[PDB]
Design a protein around this nucleic acid. Structure first.
Lengths: 76, 65, 76
RNA sequence: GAGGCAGUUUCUGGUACUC
RNA sequence: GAGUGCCAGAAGCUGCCUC
């Protein structure tokens, strides 16, 4: 029915592998009516970063960027 | 490998952690941890990251990550 | 485009009339399998209770109880 | 079936800063 | 009229844990 948010995917892949996870908002830019956010996230050794007009968005784009670099590890 | 605040809950099940909330142009939240043994603090831009920092600061005082 | 829940409603009414709100779960009662939750809420001088086989249910009912009394007031 | 923690989507109310 | 942050609240979905 409803698809999984990339953020949620990341969180569960990392539980399956006991990798430490840490999303953080790097910084904010622009005036208040045109802010631009950036979130950098580490999944153990892998990293992604995203940008967006809101914190939600930038976080998602960061999750995406890491999912690309987590598709290379071996399965169970 | 779990998320920091569930790990505290599922790490004190050997012997239930307790939280309370404390008091600029960039104002902040500060939340405390009470596990009996010791007490930790944590700050963030919203309530949500203030309680994840408060957790991962008491998993650092117990020596897990 | 979803409906307003009775629980959500109380908060809006109370905020307009500057009245304190507190929902609290009174207790769980009954045998381990038939446990029933009772929650009561206090909106100033008004009070209502509610009961349900889950917390969220009983909270909803408590909200319904006060909501009837808050229809007995002047809408000035 | 019930409880807890987390994540997330949508919606509601309020508020602050800015255009 | 608009944007973003923050607080509260509701419904849905996912994950893990307990009974």
């Amino acid at each position: 029915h409803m698809n999984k948010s990339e953020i949620s995917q990341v969180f569960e892949i990392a539980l399956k592998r006991n990798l430490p996870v840490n999303f953080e908002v790097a910084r904010e830019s622009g005036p208040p009516h045109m802010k631009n956010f950036v979130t950098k996230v580490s999944v153990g050794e892998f990293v992604g970063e995203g940008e967006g007009k809101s914190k939600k968005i930038s976080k998602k784009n960061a999750a995406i960027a890491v999912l690309e670099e987590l598709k290379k590890l071996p399965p169970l | 490998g779990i998320n920091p605040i569930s790990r505290l809950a599922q790490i004190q099940q050997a012997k239930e952690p307790e939280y309370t909330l404390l008091t600029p142009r960039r104002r902040e939240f500060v939340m405390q941890v009470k596990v009996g043994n010791h007490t930790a603090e944590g700050t963030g831009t919203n309530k949500k990251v203030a309680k994840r920092n408060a957790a991962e600061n008491m998993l650092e005082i117990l020596g897990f990550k």
